[PDB]
Amino acid sequence: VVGGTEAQRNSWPSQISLQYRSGSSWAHTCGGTLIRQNWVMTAAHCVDRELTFRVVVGEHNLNQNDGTEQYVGVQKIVVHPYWNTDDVAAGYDIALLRLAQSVTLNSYVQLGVLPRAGTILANNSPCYITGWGLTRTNGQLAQTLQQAYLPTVDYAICSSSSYWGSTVKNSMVCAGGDGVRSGCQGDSGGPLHCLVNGQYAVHGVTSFVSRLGCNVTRKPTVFTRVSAYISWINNVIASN
């Protein structure tokens, strides 16, 4: 996250770190949202590489003992059947991970609540992106969970020529684009949290930023629109 602030330890208890095996260590690659005690929602592009994955819940600092972490292997990966790795602009950038164990819920570990199906946020709806992604374009991962205030940019504006043009779809949510704050590499798969009727819900799964850089004016961060995938999600969990 570029231009973020450090999240308090208990603000975003559904945020997870998706990690892969590198040597005999694990390295953070992507964010995710805990949606069942044994299921995580992330971005399809995060799980294209044939890698060993683990999920960390109750994670705050990637390189320090928080005293709150649970570490759980990924047992099954279900990527959206329509996802095409060579065509992120087509959408469908979403995947579900079944965990090898069911995690224990507490103030640091909670299920993320999803919006009602078909819900579209009004232009300029206030949201926070969260994650451990790069803090600068071509920079380094954050050590501690970051959050940034990123207001939505509706489809009409986001798909206009100054913005993302034909690249963005109605299956996506754009947020931010002020040139100061944004998602960045390593935030992919993580949540966009938006307050609706007094409660946060996870409206986005972080998908992409400009190839020109993370925080680029009129290139808001783009997210898979969660409310487009409600029946897909439920169908996968009910059959697995």
- Report the binding-site residues for Ca(2+): 59, 61, 64, 69
Minimum CB separation of residue 15 from ligand XE in Å reads 15
Minimum CB separation of residue 183 from ligand XE in Å reads 5
Residue 66's binding partner among Ca ion, ligand XE, none (Cβ under 5 to 8 angstroms by kind) is: Ca ion
Which CB atom, from 17 or from 206, has the smaller least distance to ligand XE?
206
Distance CA 190, CA 180 (A): 19
Which of 14, 159, 182, 188 does the annotation list as catalytic? 188
Which class for 122: exposed (0-12), middle (13-18), buried (19 or more C-beta within 10 A)? exposed
Minimum CB separation of residue 40 from ligand XE in Å reads 18
Residue 206's binding partner among ligand XE, Ca ion, none (Cβ under 5 to 8 angstroms by kind) is: ligand XE
Minimum CB separation of residue 92 from ligand XE in Å reads 16
Residues 206-225 that bind ligand XE (CB under 6 A): 206, 208-209
188 contributes a contact to ligand XE by CB under 6 A: yes
User: Amino acid identity, residue 160?
Assistant: S
187 contributes a contact to ligand XE by CB under 6 A: yes
Which of 28, 45, 193, 203 does the annotation list as catalytic? 45
Residue 93's binding partner among ligand XE, Ca ion, none (Cβ under 5 to 8 angstroms by kind) is: none
- Asked if 203 is an active-site residue, the reply is no
DSSP string, the chain: -BT-EEPPTTS-TTEEEEEEEETTEEEEEEEEEEEETTEEEE-GGGG-S---EEEEES-SBTTS--S--EEEEEEEEEE-TT--TT-GGG----EEEEESSPPPPBTTB-PPPPPPTT----TT--EEEEES-BSSTT--B-SB-EEEE--EE-HHHHTSTTTTGGG--TTEEEE--SSS-B--TT-TT-EEEEEETTEEEEEEEEEE-BTTBSSBTTB-EEEEEGGGSHHHHHHHHHH-
183 contributes a contact to ligand XE by CB under 6 A: yes
42 contributes a contact to ligand XE by CB under 6 A: no
- Asked if 93 is an active-site residue, the reply is yes
- Asked if 188 is an active-site residue, the reply is yes
Task: Name the site residues for ligand XE (rule: CB under 6 A).
Answer: 183-185, 187-188, 206, 208-209
The residues assigned a catalytic role are: 45, 93, 188
